[PDB]
Design a protein around this ligand. Structure first.
Ligand SMILES: [Zn+2]
Length: 286
């Protein structure tokens, strides 16, 4: 079946997310683990966590379709030690928030070396991940591919594998594929050859079961732009045709599609409708 959803607001409480998900036509979702302004974040209370799990059960949300996404502050590739340390300590807290909520996945951008070098930046990420993983249990951290802006690490899937193969607990590191970041970086999912090459690269670098989530974003810019601006499904340079090709692969259908396109619940409900519209219009099986 198609597993699809969106990044959901948590400002009215975690427990409202399951209901909001089915109300936009989804059965999967992504959420921030908190709304902290700085390096310290609160845990959900026992009460909040219980309500969240109860609503999850009520609405039958598959726990393999529910993700947390870490915030913008954390940078494990930071050349600043104090930023690296604080980032490490906040990520641990975020893992513990996931544990409390029952969330199995925490998704992050690997980091930015801010112009101090990709190789040293990768080692820092690796070391940060070790400190986090070796001091926590259960939760799997997902590495997201990103756009090639500034010192971003991870715009090539090769970079995610270099990080992952050096981590102590590899089984607790997996992969998220963002279609907009990939498109920025030359990954052409608008052609079947492109999708096939993507799949082969994922299979060879990590194995296909390491692909835990797809961030389904159209792009404001052409293939290779490296611009990192998301676009509504069907309104960008990937388009209805591009996504139709992408959707035709069973390997792609196996993974939850999570929207990070502009707007909120209202706009995302439309994108979800658009996805099924594309599926119907182009005669995609299923
Ligand atoms: Zn992200």
């Amino acid at each position: 079946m198609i597993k699809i959803g969106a990044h959901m607001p948590i400002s009215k409480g975690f427990d409202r997310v399951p209901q909001d998900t089915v109300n936009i036509g989804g059965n999967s979702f992504q959420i921030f683990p908190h709304n902290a302004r700085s390096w310290s974040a609160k845990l959900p209370s026992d009460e909040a966590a219980t309500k969240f799990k109860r609503e999850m059960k009520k609405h039958g949300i598959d726990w393999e379709n529910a993700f947390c996404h870490s915030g913008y502050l954390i940078n494990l590739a930071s050349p600043k030690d104090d930023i690296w340390q604080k980032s490490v300590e906040l990520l641990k807290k975020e893992v513990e928030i996931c544990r409390k909520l029952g969330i199995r996945y925490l998704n992050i951008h690997p980091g930015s070396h801010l112009g101090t070098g990709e190789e040293e930046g990768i080692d820092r990420i690796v070391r940060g991940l070790n400190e986090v993983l070796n001091n926590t249990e259960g939760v799997v951290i997902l590495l997201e591919n990103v756009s090639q802006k500034g010192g971003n690490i991870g715009y090539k899937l090769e970079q995610l594998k270099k990080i992952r193969d050096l981590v102590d607990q590899r089984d607790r590191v997996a992969i998220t594929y963002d279609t907009c970041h990939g498109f920025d970086s030359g990954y052409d999912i608008t052609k079947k050859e492109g999708v096939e090459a993507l799949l082969n690269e994922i299979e060879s670098l990590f194995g296909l079961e390491r692909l835990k989530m797809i961030h389904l974003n159209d792009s404001k810019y052409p293939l290779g732009a490296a611009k990192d601006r998301h676009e509504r499904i069907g309104s960008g340079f990937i388009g209805e045709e591009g996504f139709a090709v992408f959707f035709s692969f069973k390997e792609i259908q196996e993974v939850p599609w999570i929207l990070e396109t502009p707007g909120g619940n209202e706009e995302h409900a439309e994108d979800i409708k658009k996805v099924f519209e594309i599926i119907e219009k182009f005669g995609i099986e299923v």
